[PDB]
């Protein structure tokens, strides 16, 4: 939770890091995506790409992103420190984020948390000895009608019970990727006790178009 960098042996500006040629082609596509004269607008996605090459951001992707995009490195530092998506510390392979905002706290996310500590034996912000899991607490992730919910990497696991998320942990320990969806009787956002609406068939094209269109 610090916003100042100290020169560590693992994380130094002299740490070897470079983009892969496929990542360079993606970076050039991202650069061409933006208007000429505003390549700095590509600071946010390209640095994200660097995270997808490593899983964490040392201070060598910051200087590299400054080098390709010809921006001052302090702007890259500001971008990477202002946002919480950028992992500036080496996180584990699986990044568990539990939502504990009010619509999720009302539906007992604390049981899900207490299951996570009672299963894995780590605190919030603490890493596993094998560096496989990292548990942090996040704000609302836009799955409020499917509360309670967690996310892992880029996948959403919604409508979870302590037994269900324990089973998710054992399935991840086997290496298999789970199914990123709600685990209750509903599919995406519908009510569990049947469908309230949208049971009639769609009416197709040309239903009541205005005259003179």
């Amino acid at each position: 939770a610090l916003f100042v960098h100290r020169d560590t042996p693992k994380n130094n500006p002299e740490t070897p890091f470079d983009f892969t040629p496929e990542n360079y082609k993606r970076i050039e596509a991202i650069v061409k995506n933006y208007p000429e004269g505003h390549k700095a607008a590509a600071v946010l996605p390209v640095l994200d790409l660097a995270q997808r090459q490593n899983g964490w951001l040392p201070i060598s992707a910051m200087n590299k992103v400054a080098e390709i995009l010809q921006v001052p490195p302090m702007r890259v530092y500001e971008v990477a420190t202002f946002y919480t998506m950028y992992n500036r510390k080496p996180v584990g392979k699986y990044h568990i984020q539990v939502c504990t905002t009010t619509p999720c706290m009302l539906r007992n996310s604390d049981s899900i948390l207490e299951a996570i500590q009672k299963k894995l034996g780590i605190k919030v912000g603490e890493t596993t000895p094998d560096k496989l899991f990292t548990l942090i607490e996040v704000e609302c992730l836009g799955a409020c009608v499917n509360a309670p919910m967690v996310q892992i990497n880029d996948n959403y696991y919604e409508d979870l019970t302590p037994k269900d998320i324990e089973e998710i942990i054992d399935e991840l320990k086997a290496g298999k990727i789970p199914k990123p969806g709600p685990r209750s009787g509903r599919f995406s956002c519908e009510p569990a006790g049947g469908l309230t609406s949208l049971t009639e068939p769609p009416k197709g094209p040309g239903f009541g178009v205005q005259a003179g269109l």
Binding site: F187, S188, C189, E190, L195, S197, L198, T199, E200, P202, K203, G204, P205, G206, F207
Partner: peptide, 25 residues
């Protein structure tokens, strides 16, 4: 139900172009 603009809100139809054009898009 016929005046609801956002058909296939719950994901019960196809979200690609074929499912989109068969609903009036």
């Amino acid at each position: 139900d016929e005046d609801r603009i956002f058909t296939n809100l719950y994901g019960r139809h196809d979200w690609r172009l074929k499912g989109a054009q068969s609903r009036g898009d």
